[PDB]
Amino acid sequence: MEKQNIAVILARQNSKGLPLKNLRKMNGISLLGHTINAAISSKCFDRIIVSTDGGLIAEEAKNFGVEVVLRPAELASDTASSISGVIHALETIGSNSGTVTLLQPTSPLRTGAHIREAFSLFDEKIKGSVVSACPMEHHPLKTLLQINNGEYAPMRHLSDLEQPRQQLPQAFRPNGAIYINDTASLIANNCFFIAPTKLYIMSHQDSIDIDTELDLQQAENILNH
């Protein structure tokens, strides 16, 4: 089997957060649609798969000219991991060699140009992940973690809590929009973060993710201006 570059868009119907959000529209196009358009315009992929439990999402995906994989209910439940859905997609189409890129519909401001630039960072030989990320508002060294019995432990050093921010290393958080991996690597590791992980840095604005009604309205604002 030849290598294929695969895009997998996991888009189950249920969202406790914002109801049916994968088909909620922004500027007239569903969230699913905006992500499908990003995948297509990137020209990075041989095949674009929407994996869904089915129904109106499956129909929407077919209207965009992309493939549909039907996940059983267990793999589209509230607890089902994203990795298990991507592994299932790959097994269903029978691809185990090339690249696999997770594109979440919840990042509608992530464009095809973003995908292309992230792809530029992917090393075919080295095969570490490329993951989109954004800067952190609150520095994650300036935190403590709850441990047992009402105690806490610093993230790193107690001295970090008082350290001038700019003397700490720069921190980024993965933003959910893009995860690129080598396919055989992802299958073998059963995860999206494979070392050496590269980050594709996006602004806060382009990193907005849709969990609530207010995120939807805010993202739509950002589109228009």
225 lines the binding site for ligand CTP (CB under 6 A): no
Residue 60 Cβ, how far from a second copy at the closest point, in Å? 27
209 lines the binding site for Ca ion (CB under 5 A): yes
142 lines the binding site for a second copy (CB under 8 A): yes
Residues 144-163 that bind a second copy (CB under 8 A): 144-147, 150-152, 154-155, 158-159, 161-162
114 Cα distance to chain centroid: 12
Give whichever of 127 and 209 is closer to ligand CTP, judged by the CB atom: 209
End-to-end CA distance of the chain: 46
Contact 8, 103 (CB under 8 A): yes
137 lines the binding site for ligand CTP (CB under 6 A): no
Residue 16 phi, psi (nearest 5): -60, -45
Site for ligand CTP (CB under 6 A): which residue of 5, 26, 64, 105? 105
How buried is residue 55: exposed, middle or buried, by Cβ count under 10 Å (0-12/13-18/19+)?
exposed
Site for ligand CTP (CB under 6 A): which residue of 1, 16, 147, 225? 16
Look at the alpha carbons of 4, 9, 12, 13 in this order and tell me if their dihedral is positive or negative: negative
Q: Encoding tokens for residue 46?
A: 């041989």
Give whichever of 41 and 212 is closer to ligand CTP, judged by the CB atom: 212
Contact 208, 215 (CB under 8 A): yes
How buried is residue 57: exposed, middle or buried, by Cβ count under 10 Å (0-12/13-18/19+)?
buried
Give whichever of 97 and 141 is closer to ligand CTP, judged by the CB atom: 141
Give whichever of 36 and 202 is closer to a second copy, judged by the CB atom: 202
Binding partner of 152, given ligand CTP, a second copy, Ca ion, none, CB within 5-8 angstroms per partner class? a second copy
211 lines the binding site for Ca ion (CB under 5 A): yes
Residue 212 Cβ, how far from ligand CTP at the closest point, in Å? 9
Residues 6+ apart with CB under 8 A from 205: 109, 222
Contact 58, 69 (CB under 8 A): no
Q: Interface residues with ligand CTP (CB under 6 A)?
A: 10-12, 14-17, 22, 76, 78, 80-82, 85, 104-106, 211
